[PDB]
Symmetry: C3
Subunit: 454 residues, 3 copies
């Protein structure tokens, strides 16, 4: 049950931190306008057909989004038109419902079109008639206002236009990854606010700040954006930002296991067991922490990332160490000792351990996997080049007298898995014929005992 830490530590898995488990929930919606063509009316003398190009270029990347969105709109007549939609995922359907929900306010924001069209500055605060405000973030506007405008004199009219064309095209080449043919499904709310901000030049800080515990959300990619309206004549979008909160899962924790090479039968092994185990309620399972934000106190995820675990690997973690698979160590880099509870767990065959206080070297038998070193043999431990003072071990009084039973060896390598598999299939097939040497030589040579009876 709920983890056999000591048994585990001998096989080279020492207790790491225990962590709180958190997931986003309870989203909270807020709307923003991002304008994708800058102002220019203040510096319109020496532009040329850069705009006529940029616009039709932008229209090419923008229109298919509009098109994709509108297929959910003309076809949600609360109720979504299943025949019209035809083939879709639940996720998408829900995004579509959120979209329809956004429409009501989208429509009200859209009434300020001509005022959006003529925004002077980078970030503008507008009045949506209610006393409910709405923000317009316009791309390259700052550059235009504070580079182009003041350098106008010392540049000329054929080289301001170059500087403009270049800015526009750079901005384009930057936004293209996120907003290209690439975002094929824009009826979603997965797009991270960071990724959306690409349209405002990656400055998601300002985007969040004008809307007004933050970083933890941000670095879990839990702050998401949904595109809810596209205006093709004014070249702006409305984004609904989903700013959630994060909730602690109840009697759920994520246990880290610190891996440490260990000795068996003249060679160093490392245990093949998850380094992060999720325990919620009485149930132990795998978790894909790679997708979360690990943190001193908590694993923070934008969704549940639990994953099933085989009963062997479950048994392994709760005592049966002869079920934890082990792999050969051949790199001078897999770690050779760890510290847990102020007590040291060390491969004193691989590395040389000594007692600074008592002067005598701490030497490890070949019969043992690992040493548990605490303040009842050394107070201070010299460990190569690092000197470390130890606590008393809260576990078994004679950890080092009692021997763990090591599990089976295995190869972890992609290429070695296939060879192992074909090797095995070979062996099982080879010995699946000897079992067919009994369909005759135990059936006919026993139904001959019906004739040698009758």
């Amino acid at each position: 049950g709920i983890l056999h830490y000591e048994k585990l530590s001998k096989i080279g898995l020492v207790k790491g931190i225990t962590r709180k488990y958190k997931i986003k929930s309870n989203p909270l919606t807020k709307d923003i306008v991002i304008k994708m063509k800058p102002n220019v009316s203040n510096v319109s003398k020496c532009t040329g057909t850069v705009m006529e190009n940029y616009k039709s270029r932008l229209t090419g990347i923008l229109s298919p989004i509009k098109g994709a969105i509108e297929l959910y709109n003309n076809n949600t007549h609360v109720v979504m038109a299943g025949i019209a939609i035809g083939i879709a995922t639940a996720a998408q359907i829900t995004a579509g419902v959120a979209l329809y929900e956004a429409m009501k306010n989208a429509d009200n924001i859209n009434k300020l079109k001509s005022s959006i069209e003529s925004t002077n500055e980078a970030v503008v605060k507008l009045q949506e008639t209610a006393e409910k405000t709405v923000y317009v973030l316009t791309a390259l506007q700052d550059y235009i206002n504070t580079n182009l405008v003041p350098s106008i004199d010392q540049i000329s009219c054929k080289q301001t236009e170059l500087a403009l064309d270049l800015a526009l095209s750079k901005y384009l080449s930057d936004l293209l990854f996120v907003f290209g043919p690439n975002l094929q499904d824009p009826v979603s709310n997965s797009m991270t606010i960071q990724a959306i901000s690409q349209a405002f030049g990656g400055n998601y800080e300002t985007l969040l700040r004008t809307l007004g515990d933050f970083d933890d959300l941000l670095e879990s990619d839990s702050i998401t954006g949904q595109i809810v309206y596209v205006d093709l004549s004014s070249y702006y979008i409305i984004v609904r930002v989903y700013f959630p909160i994060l909730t602690e899962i109840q009697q759920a924790y994520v246990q880290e296991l610190l891996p440490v090479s260990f000795n068996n039968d003249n060679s160093e092994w490392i245990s093949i067991v998850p380094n992060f185990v999720l325990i919620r309620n009485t149930l132990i399972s795998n978790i894909e922490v790679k997708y979360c934000l690990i943190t001193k106190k908590s694993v923070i995820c934008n969704q549940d990332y639990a994953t099933p675990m085989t009963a062997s690997v479950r048994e392994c973690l709760t005592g049966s160490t002869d079920k934890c698979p082990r792999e050969l160590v051949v790199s001078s880099h897999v770690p050779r000792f760890a510290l847990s509870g102020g007590v040291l767990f060390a491969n004193c065959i691989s590395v040389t351990c000594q007692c600074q206080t008592t002067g005598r070297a701490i030497s490890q038998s070949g019969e043992q996997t690992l040493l548990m070193i605490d303040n009842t043999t050394c107070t201070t431990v010299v460990l190569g080049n690092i000197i470390i003072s130890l606590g008393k071990y809260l576990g078994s009084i004679n950890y080092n007298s009692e021997s763990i039973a090591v599990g089976p060896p295995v190869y972890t390598d992609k290429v070695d898995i296939s060879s192992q598999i074909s090797s095995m299939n070979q062996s099982l097939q080879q010995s699946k014929d000897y079992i067919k040497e009994a369909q005759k030589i135990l059936d006919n040579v026993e139904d001959k005992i019906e004739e040698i009876l009758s």
Copy 2:
């Protein structure tokens, strides 16, 4: 033959979109000059030895490319039987050890040489280009473009701030720009690009030398976006000039062809019920069918799109006969895995008909007012307008079509495949477990 779509949909894999399959082919080559040191002729007043430094710094990252390229140029002693279009001969002994890809890139390099040499004659005019992008005449009426790094910054920041800023400031700002640009280009062009006799480099990646602005680079040259987002527009470095600090890039702008009777079928996955628990099917979500043959495809590397999967190469991959069999009827061969996340999807829509896990989620009929409840004997419900016109599904209301398949999808039971664990760590334990077991029962056969 066909995928057994109905049998599949019970095991929680519903028909998604069917897509065209496209791959790039027939490049149309076009050449461009990228100059990697800006002008500074209109600034040379406060420049310390930052140019003297920057140059020798750049030479360090540039020269080995040149060197690498020129080993193919000395080694292709070619035109075969002297003549231009007769062909090209690569020196095998000289080259020694190379890949087909590389050899071909070498041939393309030799092919680029002819025009490279003609472009190179404008060296002194490249050397003194004033502006960021310049159009030059290669004598023929055939034009050639020079894109020069940091030039714009220099022309529109520094020259304008020169009257208002000092010296050990004007030079700081320059040193900083140059070193930033350097630290940005270093990933793509460093010791990293060990094999420059290639045409893999994407034009985006190449444009790192022009500060990531691949837009302008493409636009000065001339289905564009679909090419671009499949990384099918590639660049090859064909000449390096170490005194003028410029490179010639051959850009390979291809076209994309529809593969014939080949389509990529999406399967939308849906959690399904069996023996008191939710399972998800372990079967590819994307299957490539070309001709009568079904095989895997690595779409992760392609560009997926309403109508088509667009790839810069063929990405087909073999498929085990079991997983083949599974997709064409034998659902007892489709492996399944336990579901333990409140996130794996619980229903899908295909053909206007709903496939739902009405054990996991709670389904009801808005029109008929009665809840749609699912037996524990069944994996999944197919709900079509012949039981509900409108379906309330938690919080989403949805109007349905008539299912074009079996009149009683729900009365007939599928046979669920074997359970399996998908996890990296779990595969090793499963394997060692099995070895142990087979060895253990390989002695009883010796009894």
Copy 3:
């Protein structure tokens, strides 16, 4: 020596380059100050509360580093260096060692810190300061250049909100850029893994200047061997001290990395590719796998920031050393897996899959169905036309009749993630099914 290159080449793995094996060692520490709030007193006019905001914002991302660092400092009580095990409680070796290095950095950190008020008022982007000894120390300050060469000149023709917008925007952009590396994300700052590139995110990614002010550099850089450790955080002046670990790389002895160039091959009416590592590490008499993906591959060497060796199954070992019937093979279904390679100036080609011909002798080079691959050298063709590429050949230094002698092909296998589970469960099902007949 170790490997069986000829036997291997028939199964479609031809000798590629042999490379030197190098790892970083012998690091060489040098210190630097990164200031994360620009000067701005030269436009202290209409900034507004943006500084008051920016500062408290920054404090939020910065303080937890300080905090984390100081827990090692508070708990290394020494000179004998002794680390407090009870206080530390639960840590890795790596981290402990980082801690020792941190304590080692403290001595100089403390001396650098005396110049606090002079750090506070640095005018320019990069400054050289005197740490009293004649030992200099550098201050790189963020956004300073932008401020000095955009905003200060663009004061005169810009409104008071206009100036402050441009500032707020620069600051917040810089923030949104640094946040990935320095956020809640860097949960363990008592380490020296952070690459100097990643560190330079605080100076706006310009790791070039950072390295250049401190003074075979690229190979280090592109192996991510040049690392930074944060050794001090100042929360009132908003600067950090970084100890940069600039190592040197050493050749491993009698160790090389062998590349294998893969080439589709023919067997029993279909094209196969061999499932064998493309890079094999041989050090001493021992052959093993190596994870090159993490290193820097280079004409002469594989360059790694650590040893990346990995064990190899005795079957795959045996395979590379003769037993080709142990090298697993997989069916080819993509018009993209390569069809010929060149090694030693001799050609190894699938002349069933592609059509091979002799330009010199005019006659086409055709391959039996009994053979996997053709070895083509100048003793049959001097020049070879191979689709659209013409190539002149050397003499093969191996067996005089490579093409008469047949290799024994290994077992077929499926490589695919999804196909492994089915293979595994199939093998299970079958073993269970035939584990009952043994109970009969």
